[PDB]
Amino acid sequence: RFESVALEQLQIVHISSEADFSAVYSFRPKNLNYFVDIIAYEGKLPSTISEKSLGGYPVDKTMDEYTVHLNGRHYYSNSKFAFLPTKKPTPEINYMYSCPYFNLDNIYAGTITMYWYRNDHISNDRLESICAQAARILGRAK
Amino acid sequence: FESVALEQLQIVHISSEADFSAVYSFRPKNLNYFVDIIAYEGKLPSTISEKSLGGYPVDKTMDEYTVHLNGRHYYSNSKFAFLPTKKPTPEINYMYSCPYFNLDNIYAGTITMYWYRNDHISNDRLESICAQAARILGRAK
Amino acid sequence: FESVALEQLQIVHISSEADFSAVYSFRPKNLNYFVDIIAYEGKLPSTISEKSLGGYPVDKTMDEYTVHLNGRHYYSNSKFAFLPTKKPTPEINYMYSCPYFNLDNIYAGTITMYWYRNDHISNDRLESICAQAARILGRAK
Amino acid sequence: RFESVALEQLQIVHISSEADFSAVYSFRPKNLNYFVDIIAYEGKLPSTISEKSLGGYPVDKTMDEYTVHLNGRHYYSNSKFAFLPTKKPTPEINYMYSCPYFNLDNIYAGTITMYWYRNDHISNDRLESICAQAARILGRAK
Amino acid sequence: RFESVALEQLQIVHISSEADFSAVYSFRPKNLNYFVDIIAYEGKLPSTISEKSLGGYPVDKTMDEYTVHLNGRHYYSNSKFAFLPTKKPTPEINYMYSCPYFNLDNIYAGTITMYWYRNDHISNDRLESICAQAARILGRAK
Amino acid sequence: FESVALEQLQIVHISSEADFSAVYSFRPKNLNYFVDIIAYEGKLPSTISEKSLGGYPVDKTMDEYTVHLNGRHYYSNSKFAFLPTKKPTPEINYMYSCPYFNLDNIYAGTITMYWYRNDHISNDRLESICAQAARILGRAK
Amino acid sequence: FESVALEQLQIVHISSEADFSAVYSFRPKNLNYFVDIIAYEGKLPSTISEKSLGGYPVDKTMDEYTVHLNGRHYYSNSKFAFLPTKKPTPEINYMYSCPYFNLDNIYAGTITMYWYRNDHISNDRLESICAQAARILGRAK
Amino acid sequence: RFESVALEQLQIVHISSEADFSAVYSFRPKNLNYFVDIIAYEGKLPSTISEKSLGGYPVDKTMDEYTVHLNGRHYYSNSKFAFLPTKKPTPEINYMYSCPYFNLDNIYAGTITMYWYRNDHISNDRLESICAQAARILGRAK
Amino acid sequence: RFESVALEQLQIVHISSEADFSAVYSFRPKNLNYFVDIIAYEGKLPSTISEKSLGGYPVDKTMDEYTVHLNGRHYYSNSKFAFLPTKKPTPEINYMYSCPYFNLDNIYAGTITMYWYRNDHISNDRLESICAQAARILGRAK
Amino acid sequence: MNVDPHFDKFMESGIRHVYMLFENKSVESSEQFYSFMRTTYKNDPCSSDFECIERGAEMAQSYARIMNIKLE
Amino acid sequence: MNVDPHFDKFMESGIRHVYMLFENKSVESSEQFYSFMRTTYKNDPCSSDFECIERGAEMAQSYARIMNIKLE
Amino acid sequence: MNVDPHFDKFMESGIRHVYMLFENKSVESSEQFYSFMRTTYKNDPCSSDFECIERGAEMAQSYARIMNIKLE
């Protein structure tokens, strides 16, 4: 089932990447993507979001993470957190790395995202392999 | 939905006085790789046939596709993007089409009228005929 | 049809700002001996209950029935023909209703708004809200 | 089946009544009655109608046969032939007698009609009994 | 359906017999017959029973109407009213005549009963034929 | 019910130490014109066979039927009312049976033990064995 | 089984003269993580409701669970282990329960009586009422 | 199917462990465990049991292998053979090592057991890994 | 599905073996094997066959590749190309290596074949392992 | 309407004199009532206003009594 | 019992004079026999002891003959 | 009747000593009474005339008292 696969892959990604905080984001409605939810996370929540604010955040499709994912590439940044469900800056985050996942109907359905509150993170070529594998598996689950 | 398409196309065909009219439908949902004629009125163009009305590949770079996605109607004397033949079909003098969008707000097909003759009623009248059918088909599925 | 009724009533209820709104449906088809509430929004009048929303007898001699069959909307401060109780329900200050007609062109039910408070938007605005829903419900079955 | 019952009852009515020409009329669409068809007949067609003109005749609901039937009574006339599918007068007909039939959903669905080209016909009290029985049976068939 | 047949046969019996009051009695539970209900009646209720007392009356199987019926005979009396749902005498009744009916599983299921508040009633040979026919039909209905 | 009959008869057969035991069942319900063996333990009497265990006519004038309807157990050295053969079967030295009554309180069958040998445990012990099974079978359908 | 539970509880409730009685059932089979009220008689305690009768977590460390597994009945003035609320419910003055064990010999639920009033018949009488129902429910599934 | 999985895992365990004799034990009835069967074995049977005595042996739940397994641990011994279907001592066995398996309903369902007729066996940390993997797989099969 | 498995295994075999041209052959009718088709290939077609001649070639069961496969062995040759759909010699091929595959009903169903237009090829022990694995997988697919 | 006027009087009388007294009105109770009235009429149709009204009220009363339907 | 006494005589006569001669008694053969006797009676019930006994024996005989049921 | 004679004695005793005194007799009151008596008996069948008569009356009386049934 999708939910068990999402939780398993998020655990693998979080442990492999050594990230401080990792999340699975999911878009709604299908094929329209006006809202995004954090459906699962590992590690410590950023101070700018809360357990009660994980759902129903509006998607700004003009954020370049959205366009980079639809161009077939992973996304990373030190300051731009498109789907993190707060309008506040979050300077405690020093790095994010995300990859899109596409459902069985080949539609952009969400992201798998890793965050660092510290400056050191493993290299992008390793993060790419970790994310790509998880996104392949999650994209087969629903 | 198939009943609604047939009923709406009959009104479109009679009120537009077209020679040939069709409802086109895209598949798979949301992806629109193929287009089928799911209802037609009038005389089929010589370049297509009853046995070849489904499964035609969609070239999304054709002007009609991009115009419809801009929410506008399309007309042309020579370009018949979804007509299910690769042949030019010069017997058609005019086409007028309007997109319809399904209940999930996705581009789902077209309503199209064709003229073999060189006269047709004004685009302003065609626009109203098409829009009315498109709004109803858009709610039907 | 039941989905369409629910969706349309939500828009009717919000745009009219009514306190209670309902879609009524007649049975048997064509004969209209009974009337059911098949969807409602807002707070149920105290005189009716969830367990008593169906099977209410239709008195076709009531003004609302004859006005609807003349193709007009109905409003009243005191007469609630299809509200499924014999009690007068004085807590209602106003009702506004419009008929809908099914795909076979037969009077099939109503869309009705109710106010417990003494203020309501103009009948001209209620007329447009109701008519739009009635045309769509009329095509849905 | 309705069609076999219609034919059987029309035969009974025609023979019992000694009419010259008898017909079953049927309205369409259901519950709207904009058109009427002669679906079966016995005896000799009036000269003003033909085999090819039996279907699709417009119903004038303002003809008093329509209102008399909806008031619960049989109808008879020497000159008014509401559903006979011609606009021409038919003076060869000297008498008509009709009764409505109502389908299983209790809707006015058509008529059973007898015609005379002669002046003598059996009395209305007998025609009423003949028609009422046939209409009861036909009203159970569909 | 049983209930329509019961009502139709009771009407026929009441009219044919010229009785003042007629009833269909039904036993419960099946094959045990501890209680009896008046499920339908025609004419005027005896003054000793009421609309609200028609159901759930205990069956005294030692009343000879019960044994006479199981012996294959109709029952009649001027004073003994076994299943009439009152313990009071009812002297306003001058005559009763009843026949049993047996269901499709051949079990004693109730009675069809006629009552007279006057002294004149049609002869028993006629009442027997009237009752026997109704009981045959009712015994086929359930 | 058929499982309950089998389980109960196994206990009856072992605890009574009978040579042959059977559960009999009447049909049709309430009327009891026929009797079937629906479960048995031990060695079938020579006068009956596997292919002949059902559909035997019930003679309600036999002593066993009237005793059971008086609510008592039955025993005999020679009368085997429901044993599905017309032959006398002298190889049986003793039978003991008890009725069971279904959930509608109707006489529905028997639990019966048979001895080919000339010794058997006391009727007092057979009575308890039978009654226990009869109460449980009586609740099972 | 559900019919048997209802029938048995009616007798338990009337013969014990309790104010509220219930049959509890454990799930999943053999594991008993959750407990449901599957039949009740009388007036529901104010702390529970019709919509909340199923899916209550079982705390196997509660005295009632361990006593039942020792094969004994349980009674208390204040501990209501399986009553589907975390609230204390002081309106209950007494509870008496007995376990039942299914056809696979596994602890499967309880039969429980409750008193809001301060008087109740003797435990010796409650013991017989409960045991009789428990033996029958234990055979029903 | 369970039986194919049991045979495959027993083969893997026997080969990996280098045991002299290996068996799968299975309890009956479900959730009651009054009897135990050797349903499959590899290697040479101990001289104290036979092919005809593999089924229906009574379970003594007071043997500490039973309690150790329900406490979440593997069991090993030089002399105590709880489910081996003989009451005789078997001194030819110098070592046993067993792990429980739990079915899909999470119930103690049997054991996977290895035996040595010699004094040398591979270390318990290796036997634990071998057994735990087989028991995980067998516990998913039924 | 069989066709996806055939294509996947052919790709694996072609890449692993470093062959110049690889094909999956399939026999028809089932259990009779009168005809053979090239249903998939990788690499460059031999000049003696064409895209339009891949189907319906007659099987000569007296060619020793057929008998070697039914004897349980792989086949190799420098000059004998039994199922290659041409009667012409093909001297451009310097080596062929094939293994049979057997369907789920255990019937000889086709071959997996590698060809070299050059003299150097990896050793037969490696080709055997490559082919045997692919044939095991393909034999489970239909 | 285009209705059988004798059935309509029969049904309306049953509704106005008996069905309106039903304690528990529902889709089901109205469907079962209409089904019984429709079939009863078709089996033996009334043919004048006061006959239809009398027979409709009596048959609805008979229906409520034989089905043990709670009134008032 | 609470049985129709005329059916009971009809059935018992069929049983005692004919069904007891059936060569192959079974659940099925008894069910089909009862079904035929029950329906035959209900279609035209007898109404006195000796009539029921005569008609039950004759109808069971007719049943065995028309169904080619083996007797004795 | 083919009835369990002990249940019949038990039930008739409850009817004759208690149910007959119910003020409001109805289909529902009779159905509820039989339901209680049926299960009470089946749980623990009486086995003599005296026990059946005594227990039938006592159990019906407890039912009427506990359910607060209005008597005559």
Added chain:
Amino acid sequence: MNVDPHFDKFMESGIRHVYMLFENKSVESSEQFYSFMRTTYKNDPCSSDFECIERGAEMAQSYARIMNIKLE
């Protein structure tokens, strides 16, 4: 009739001004005419006597012209 009064006015106007002039009336000609009129109305219902009469006649006339229906 329980008919939508605007549709009825629209349809009757098309019948009385156009359909009545059809040379070849048949079941099929009537079915095709109603189909066209039904959907034309439902797409955009008329809402006054004058609009319904005018539009019913105009739309029926266009239908007869465009379909080349022979008139009288």
Added chain:
Amino acid sequence: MNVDPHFDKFMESGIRHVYMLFENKSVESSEQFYSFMRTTYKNDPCSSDFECIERGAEMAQSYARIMNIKLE
């Protein structure tokens, strides 16, 4: 995206002017908002940038006011 561009402009205007100000955002608040906006549009589609932006904002605002949605 293959989205109806007028609906998209309408929805984005409601999101950017109103929904973004919702104090309590959730799966349920977003689902209810889209449901209202979807049907409002489909009943009467806007057909220009200006109309879609204006109507999307106005209709979302009415929804928040009428449903008493707490804003920021």
Added chain:
Amino acid sequence: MNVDPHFDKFMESGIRHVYMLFENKSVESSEQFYSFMRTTYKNDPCSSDFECIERGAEMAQSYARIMNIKLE
């Protein structure tokens, strides 16, 4: 274990005093033994340690004697 403790004591007594002495133990011998013990208990459950131990042994012994089971 969540087992009925009286059945468990009964069964273990039958196992330890009787079943353990069976000469030919098998899947089938164990299944038949449990079947007999299960129903014997459920018909009339023992309710004390002493009664369960005594009855379990006595009933298992009767089963072995009556079925002529070869013991050790």
Added chain:
Amino acid sequence: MNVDPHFDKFMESGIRHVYMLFENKSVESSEQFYSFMRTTYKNDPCSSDFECIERGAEMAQSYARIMNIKLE
């Protein structure tokens, strides 16, 4: 009981830390919860007391979050 002790700790921890906070407990909600916990454990079983307790509480929390189950 005869339960897997590591699953039991896993499940009990999920119950005691998360399921007991479910706002709407039902047969369905408990069945879906047990189904998710059972499958999760079987896919990757824990193997010591505190590991099982930590993982059971976290997986139940993850379950409630991903299924949008209302807590407290």
Added chain:
Amino acid sequence: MNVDPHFDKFMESGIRHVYMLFENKSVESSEQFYSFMRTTYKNDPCSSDFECIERGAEMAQSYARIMNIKLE
């Protein structure tokens, strides 16, 4: 659109180089083609433009060959 850009290139290449040559295009033939391309991609997705285009054309060609689909 919101499509996987690598699947889209894979599919479009298959369409433009192979499917457009299908002799008998139909709903069925397009559905079976899409089903094969979708599953093939998901099993082993390409990850750059020219790789996707090469693999999509080759896999569509392989599909037509193995299914004996008539081209041109």
Added chain:
Amino acid sequence: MNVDPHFDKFMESGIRHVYMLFENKSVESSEQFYSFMRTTYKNDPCSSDFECIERGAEMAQSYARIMNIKLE
């Protein structure tokens, strides 16, 4: 092979004398050839080597001539 040896001789003769000369071999040409040969044989099986070889060649030749199959 477990093949009918006479059919096999017949078929192989048709293959070796005729089918091998077909200019355009395909899945379809092979399927049509086998269909003809299969039924020709089954209608009237040959029963000796000489008859099977002769008839297989003659019948395949007639098939190629009558169907105008291009040979090499």
Added chain:
Amino acid sequence: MNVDPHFDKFMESGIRHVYMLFENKSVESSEQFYSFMRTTYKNDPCSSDFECIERGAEMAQSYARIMNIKLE
């Protein structure tokens, strides 16, 4: 035949050493035996004569033992 020679040796060994000893041979018992041998082989095929013969006999023996199939 056209059979997999390693499966054939595997199966024939199972047949000749074990299946021929089955006490109750039937269509069902042979189908279940073949199903188990076929699947076992396909999961891990043997690849030489004496290996296939040894493994086939042992797997058939294992099958009979685990299914409690009566031999001899």
